[model samples]
Target: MAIIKREWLEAATDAHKKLGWKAKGAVVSAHDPSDTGPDAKGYASRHGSVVKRIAEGLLMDINEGADWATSLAIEDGADHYLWDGDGVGAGLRRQTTEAFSGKKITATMFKGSESPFDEDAPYQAVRTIGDVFRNKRAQFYYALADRLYLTYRAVVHGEYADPDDMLSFDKEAIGEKMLEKLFAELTQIQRKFNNNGKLELMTKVEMKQKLGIPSPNLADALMMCMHCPA
Candidate 1:
């Protein structure tokens, strides 16, 4: 899949804050209209988020591409939007913001090289965690891979896992041809060790020159969905 959608809930508040946990759920005249005996929001839980690949495509023109992304997200009922705000897509961010100017959806800039954005902030994964990434690009790249592994574990290995730890892509939603293109671009990414032997991917420069992979536009889109900026 080329485009991704993620939903996250506020985690439990710190004990010192004297506040209770939080989440979006049934509240009187709030998210849910029906009054109920039980409530769903304002509680703590370990599972607080989900990531899904919901759309995919390739477009050359930056304007149309960014515009299409914004439109697709809004029509799909996204409350917020994130994009490659560090590349050619960055050029479209201004207009993209204007496109979202009056809407409920908030457009955000994702610079994959700025710094690592960690989702497992309170705790770290047992393996392949985000704390060691060379940059934000590597961080989210591996983060996508990590959830994919969790996705495989529960589906194939029959292992019990946290739902939020898993990832899924709907073949029907993304289309068969686009799915194939996404996987192709995904596997084409090459990893290398930095001067300090830290893990990192090859530059897009070498990615084109040596690997013969195209722009990997879809893969880029998929990776950014792994997480978003605050």
Candidate 2:
């Protein structure tokens, strides 16, 4: 499935322009619940999809569509793009601030173990999600998956279905296996949704218990896009 389609990019660019959104980049990553637990290593490992989505989005924003550049976050421990061994903790923050001094860089924080936001940082604070979405990290996957499944059903059945009417829809048009495949497609980063709510990816356990999928990286990638600013 093509997640970043030309039509979607065009529509998104128009929506972004109409919204009067400033050209800015959003560099996203998985949440770091613990300050010293596994952020550094985890970021290094899971950054593949994060980097890919950011690059594609930014390209559309820049050349073909929106005018956005990628910006780093407070938790991203690095001197430049992608975390390296040298710049960790304050070193990352200090360098990022210096590099993007005059640009529109925002540090986005999700509620977790500890707040990584620094009062003296150069970037602006673009509101926090707090605990609203964080509280239902596990359930949110099912919610998004169901939404995607409903969308597919709407297309397949040639019937108009409300987004919230996942339970009311007839499952005879498509079986449960197909729905699971669609869920995996959406969460696997093979397809992207036009999501506009506060986004938070489910933890490994959450994904496993809820979706029977063991890979944690995929859902987080999808969530990163949901969390991304248009």
Candidate 3:
């Protein structure tokens, strides 16, 4: 799957912070008291935080396609760019902030390569999915990005299904298999960082550090373009 751009990612971080972590369980519990739990807020926060981490990683990975070659190779850029100490580049947890600060060196600027803004267009180039959070319209753009990936797989692997084709495959079963593969990939790293369970966002740091790798450059680029805070 294609990764989100930088500028859009920065926009997305801002939007998420402003919107705050959505308490999906809270909303659910509010409607049905029976669904309430002791740690609903904590659970929701954790879930939102996980998604945010994944989003952040995605932004950087997309920004630097080559940087995340390993992850990109697995599913043609479906997962965020990551490193297992064997890759030729950095990972998100370590390199994101630094990479974000040095985008202008390689990026194509708007005004005669002087101004950041593309004078001809209302906005500059698309950097990351973060921008999608800038407004409601951006949501549609991200949705489209997601749809595009799904479509790509459908056409190439699903027998040329229509754009709105229903998902006939059992996604849960497929995801479980994917997760198993991901765990196997993690085992390739040093024993200290090897994961024995599912790879959650919050716990990714340990594994990433053990490998001493950084995420793809685009992940940071996305945040930079969006002007997100460190």
lDDT tens digits by residue: candidate 1, 1-230: 22122210011111111122222221100010001222111100111233223344332245655556666665555565667656555565577778777777666677777756653454366533344667777777777676666555555466666655654444444455655665666666667757755457765556878766656656666666555434
- The digit string of per-residue lDDT tens for model 2 on 153-222 reads 4544545544332221122322444323323434333322225443345444444566675433333333
Order candidates by TM-score, high to low. Answer: 1, 2, 3
Model 2 lDDT, full chain set: 0.31
What lDDT score is found at residue 173 in candidate 2?
27
Prediction 2 TM-score vs. true = 0.32
Highest lDDT: give the candidate number. 1
Question: Which lDDT tens digits does candidate 3 get at residues 151-221?
Answer: 44543454343433211112232244432332233223221221433111211234356555432222222
Scored by TM-score, the top model is 1
Error of 1 at 9 (Å): 26
What is the lDDT, from 0 to 100, of the residue 216 in candidate 3? Answer: 24
lDDT of each: 0.49, 0.31, 0.25
The model with the greater TM-score, 1 or 3, is 1
The positional error of residue 15 in candidate 2, measured at the CA in angstroms, is 18
